[model samples]
Target: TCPFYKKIPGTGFTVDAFQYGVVEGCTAYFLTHFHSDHYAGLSKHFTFPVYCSEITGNLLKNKLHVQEQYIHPLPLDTECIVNGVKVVLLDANHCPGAVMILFYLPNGTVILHTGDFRADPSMERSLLADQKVHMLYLDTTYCSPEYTFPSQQEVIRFAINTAFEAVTLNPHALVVCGTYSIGKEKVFLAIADVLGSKVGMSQEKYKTLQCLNIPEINSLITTDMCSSLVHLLPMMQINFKGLQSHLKKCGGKYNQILAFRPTGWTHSNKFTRIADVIPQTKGNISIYGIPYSEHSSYLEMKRFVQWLKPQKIIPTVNVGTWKSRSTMEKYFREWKLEAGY
Candidate 1:
């Protein structure tokens, strides 16, 4: 057996699978969250020791319908040894039970697999219990200045301002924001919170959040969950049409229909106006630039890479995730920063 093998003994690599596929000699697997991208595939392979945060483990049983016996529940920041590689979980900031993985190899390489992460200081505080990391397989998912991660408070302000203006102007328009099913719940919770004073998150958001596997279960990390919001299914609303019926019911008293979403458009055309969806409805729909990105922005990208100072930075996940290696070389030419990694 090769001492440095992180994957199958002969495959030379291991994949972060949605499920465990049969890879002979594959050493171990990690289920990061209950989100679809994380634990959708575990039953496929004959067997592989699965590791994940305790909250994620609970979700697998409650939400994902996975077998409990197969899972090995790990406490946050607790190092779980898998085939000699040490695995550590840190808050990922993307979902309720989301955790990023840090795999330490015997060869002195410490790789932090930031599974869709942002620099949420709260999330960082959760992982500080396990100090020291050598190499970070960071989430460069939003590694462009065009992409930005807005703070939670900023998102609430944006949502509230838009919602309030609409309500104030027209007296009765519903403001709707769409986000990743799990990722965007926090935003809506904030919106309702500020708009409807002392309102708790809807049952769905509350359910997901309560099941979270943080180091502390009931921390009094208080914020605005105030509002008597109409629960349009407590999950993520990524599209406008899904809310059309609810909007219709919201009535005509609203002079504005404020909407928020993280959308993609065709670069093929000059622009794609998701905000213009209700152009005919007289409802004000702005793509209020509230970013809840799990990835870092371009400037943040440079900051992270410069901090890590790796010989080679690899890109995976989304097309927007990283600047191409060639592009990095080009930037080196453009900027007069000292050369050589």
Candidate 2:
């Protein structure tokens, strides 16, 4: 659940909480990433000093046009002091420039605020592994036994293979992929690279990708749709009606549409491979809902909690309702119990 206020209870700092207005006592404002949900209230009008990773800062400036002086870009893995507290930033593995923040308070309490993350084994090697966290502010987006999905690499491979197979059957098929403003570049990029297909996007989206400085972006992306068979569209535009209109607009350049709607919501414990999950199909159109998630799964969350053994668990997402919070608390208790503490 999103907190009504952004302020961390024990400290005079606010994290990812710009929408509720300037938090009364916060001396410094921390942004986890450039995701709109996390940086909801921030705009050019925002007056507070914002701290985030260098990549996030770049996006904030380019995307939101936030003034340079107000944005403080911090280096990853480096320790720094803010408002009398020690802080470190580590890769979140959720998106480009996303970070899991570690705060060491003056009184010796350590708090870890994971803005949003996809759990990976490499996180075990981070600085947090050596310290006991007093409180863990977690991204509990999929905090249940039923939400397990395949890894990002597996899903990316599946997307590439699926797209390849689709195009092989019908060489004229145009492969369209759904994407967010800043995340899920791996899915569409992988499909295009493996299939040797040029990606089509609007000039605006092309400029947005330019901020990330992807190595092969210039060669792969073209603003001209006729020159490309693979098109990157906003997630909402990947639906049946949407793709139908898009195919119609193409005026016979492409024969059929093969679209990938990559998101975590597509998976459950019942499905193993993304190919096994059902796809929505209409005449000349197919949309596969692949589980290319940016957040951690239930098992991953449990593993993280068991290893860290934080004294308290504070969920950052899906906390709006009492039932939801209770459900998450049960999972937290179960993880701790299984950890033998």
Candidate 3:
């Protein structure tokens, strides 16, 4: 374990870096969310003191089977001392229990690591607004001008209306929502609530959702495929062949499949409005790839950087190569210059 781990600088904290097994100088491990990409390195063999939000901690213990003793659930908007450094957890607004980890070093440095976020307006009112962030570990997933899309609320509204209209016209239609193991619960859950339909998912996924403890989630969800008009399936299974097989599995309960494949990558700059975005359809299956991303958009990132005006920024995503990292750096530089820094 070298002094310089290169992932999280200026602290003895290894954030979302469990894959390296153990870093020598890191005294505490921080996880911002339960997403597999961030928690990829952690395993049953892990023996580090992990800090995360209460919901995320539950998922880590129940879903991943990580030891409960090593997992510390931090309260939101409250400060706690970890290895002599003050730390705070703010809601990331990307997924259930996702958080932005804030570090207050003894040397008067404030490091804000945004695990994965959507950059909502409420973040501006967080404790970070009062402090001068020294180094910002940013989620630069869509750190490009071409990646601009509608806000999460707008996308959710569109999805709800689309499903509502489709079901209103034909009561026998089935609505399929594409989602991951976590995240995108808002989209499908909203659709189910608005349409007053029973939500269906695998028993495994239902068990995972139980960890979230969302009010009314259990009431909306059902494991019986035939009883649910709205089915939540993995993203890959939302395709034509997949939906066809799923429909067959349901024993001909649905006449047509209206699927919502919500993701940031689905949107293109060519579309001016969310309604203008078209859905790809073939026979009885229609796949609408809306822009419902958990990551921040280019414009949102720009706004966040301008508002925070951090002393330094570290890109967390799309940094696999020099060219990609440099491309993102250019955007940061431009945003910083505009902030009069």
Candidate 4:
């Protein structure tokens, strides 16, 4: 399959795009998850009897806004036969619509492609037994020990501690922070859980991050009311010179809080690049980051792989990432996470 193309003369099957389990003919084409990286091509290039989980199928048509098609939604743990194989959707744990596909072929080759997974114990306990997973396509986004991130709870606690105190320290200014457009919700959830739900966003990445914000959190924010959103991370916080007054007001004795996604200030003018401090402003604190990330970190990613102990590990997200050479070795030194990334 590595060195092959469409229209395999020996098998007499044509493949115009990517290849997976492309030995001979198969019954159906299955979609593993909703991320554009996986479904972008199939949704546009060709049409086959497609199958997916209910929420993921809903996302394909609703969120990402792909072409309309009758998606056969199969419940988790349910097997649907298409072509010559049985495709089973397992909880992916990456996001609401994410899922992993388990192939039960007639030839007894039980290959499991974990679209993505995490170190969330809640997630692990929710899935089927571990031994059943013989082969896995783990998401080695951060397959290194040093990169082992603090747990979601730890991150949440830190975010709450920083945000809650910022409010008490300066009741006048507004606190603004950022988060990704999709998935990576634990950051705000931790804050909202402490501040009370009803989280508010600035109309940018709101729709994407909103799904994971629970109704209970919504209940709290309705009354407590989150002050404002530092939306879309680094994108919206450009041109600090113009927002000097805004930053000052945020640092004042007024109630101002802007929850932002991680890495929003890495290159943004608001925090890193300009005269960002508003001394007179009461609560002018620009957090460097929250440990909020959608993709798995080095430790968590490697844990997934080690758990699966798959036959062949395929790191898909960073396709052909030779740049990770030196970076990976550095991660290898970390003892908290996996040996290397």
Candidate 5:
């Protein structure tokens, strides 16, 4: 259950609730991001105060009818005492407006709940400062040696270049790139910039993008897909295996169409090569998967653990295929990180 809620033993605050199917008398709820999986079981009927970034706060208030008073938007890198525990938020770098929570408990133990983030060079200083991470609630999404890749910006650049090359090869082809609903706006914008066109978004997505206020990107959102040869589609809609059938439908719609996905799922140790873009072709369509990930790869996670030196590591996601605790312990031990500073 990647969405499990944890009630700090003494503190009244709760962290990321899917506290469903049980009684959770938590005083306050802290949402890490706007990701549906993270905020599962949230309802308008609930009255607990929710803490999250301003973007997330606005999203829940407008879309879910979550009460305005219950939504507390905390700025990044600021500390506040909540329910007697000193709390701070940092940019998670996982998605737009995602945050990592740092809790300075009254018991002198420090808890760092890194809510799905890629290791950012900018955040390293802050993360290492006063590092007494007694417990670390880790995002073990790619906590295996098989996962390793370059930075997201580099991957995005590859994607942008790939889009340019694809269109150059077939001038009439429409290039559609897969992205998350909220994140990966940069990839779309980059392609649009190089292609000399605006990225298209539906009316609802347009409104959401407006709040982000990156004029370069905000101006790119359009309802008209034909306005630009390059289109942005949600990741879920871009099925990897069904491209043949999909292109058959798109084949007549355009002279030719190219599609690609930007994700970390492209990583493989058995694979001999690690490139910016991994290419795949089916029928009339050319699709690619860029290794642009929002979460830390196993190699990156090892470095993070070494720096944080947390006494204990706890995998937050209760669902999904994750290695057991003992497996993680062995890795930590092999890395000689069992001795905390």
Candidate 6:
């Protein structure tokens, strides 16, 4: 709560309440997304009114078992008033129903809390054109220059192609996709659509996708692990030994296990090449760490900062630490205009 959650001056509104979780005794609380890391301390015991996008709100109740009465589904691109303060929700482009919270302060200071987002030109054009942001809470996940990678769409295409080709090479292999509880649904859906096969999921994952009512996504879910040519399994469940065991015991006929993990963390070093197709292998299984991140890379963040020209910035990550305040000084040459005079 201390780092991710912050009290809005004068209005008493709170955003991303992760620490010391409980909504009561605080002003209105806002959740940018349903990522567990962002909602560190939140639980089913939530009592205060929680504002989030419809997808997030649904997931909160169904997946997390949060109380429905306390969940308030705020329509995207709409403004609403809470605690006598004007607030607007904008798509974060991080995941389904992820949003960035914009606060129009009484003193005319526009504060923006970017809820783990990639810089979308469409979103900026529609919501932030000509707007002056006084204070900005930025997601600096890849704040260093080492995070240079291709677009999410490009990466997604690469993933699909790799998986397709991998399966083609090993026709009897069970292509397992490594994903989280929520993010990377689109990747599985695309693979399912392109490969002419349904994607297998856990009952809980199926239920999560079911509640969203997305036809394209819903059609891809399968209960039978081997029903589909590919299985969209959680990252934690993906292991070479267990899969090999399944293939061995049941005479599953799968000669190989191919797993694709679409994430931005693949950019681990400076020498890492950004290739059209890349897949690494461990033991008998091939694990491809696709660079499909939700947040902007260092160059993207720098460009956005230059364009936004916020008077001040606050890094959302590492909240209690003070090092980033000055560590980020080099990235804010544009903000120097305000420092002049």
Give the alpha-carbon lDDT of every model. Answer: 0.52, 0.85, 0.84, 0.50, 0.72, 0.74
TM-score for each candidate, following the candidate numbering: 0.68, 0.94, 0.94, 0.66, 0.87, 0.89
Off by more than 4 A, model 5: 1-5, 19-23, 213-215, 239-253, 267-269, 272-278, 318-323, 337-341
Q: By summed lDDT, which 10 consecutive residues of candidate 4 come out lowest?
A: 273-282
Model 5 Cα lDDT, one tens digit per residue, 24-141 = 5667788988888778877787677888888888888776778887888988787788777789999888878888999898988888888888876666688447667888888877
Error of 3 at 83 (Å): 1.5
Off by over 4 Å in 2: 1-5, 267-272
lDDT of 5 at 104: 90
**Span of ten consecutive residues with least summed lDDT in model 5:** 267-276
lDDT of 2 by residue, 65-181 (tens): 899999998888999987777899999998888998998888888989999998888899989778889988999999988887888888887788888988998888999988876
Better of 3 and 6 by lDDT: 3
Q: Model 1 clash tally? A: 13
Cα lDDT of model 1 by residue, 153-252, tens digit: 5545656666666666664555555534555555555555556523333455555556664443243222223233323343244245555555555455
Clashes of 5: 5
TM-score of 6: 0.89
TM-score of structure candidate 5: 0.87
Candidate number with the higher TM-score (1 or 6)? 6
Question: Each candidate's root-mean-square deviation in Å?
Answer: 6.5, 2.0, 1.9, 7.4, 3.2, 2.8
Clashing pairs in 3: none
User: How would the candidate models be sorted by lDDT, starting from the highest?
Assistant: 2, 3, 6, 5, 1, 4
lDDT of 5 at 9: 55
Kindly indicate the candidate among 2 and 6 with the higher TM-score.
Answer: 2
For model 6, the superposed segments whose C-alpha errors exceed 4 Å read: 1-5, 21-25, 267-269, 282-284, 319-323, 334-341
Clashes of each: 13, 3, 0, 41, 5, 1
Using TM-score as the measure, name the better of candidate 3 and candidate 5: 3
Error of 6 at 44 (Å): 3.4
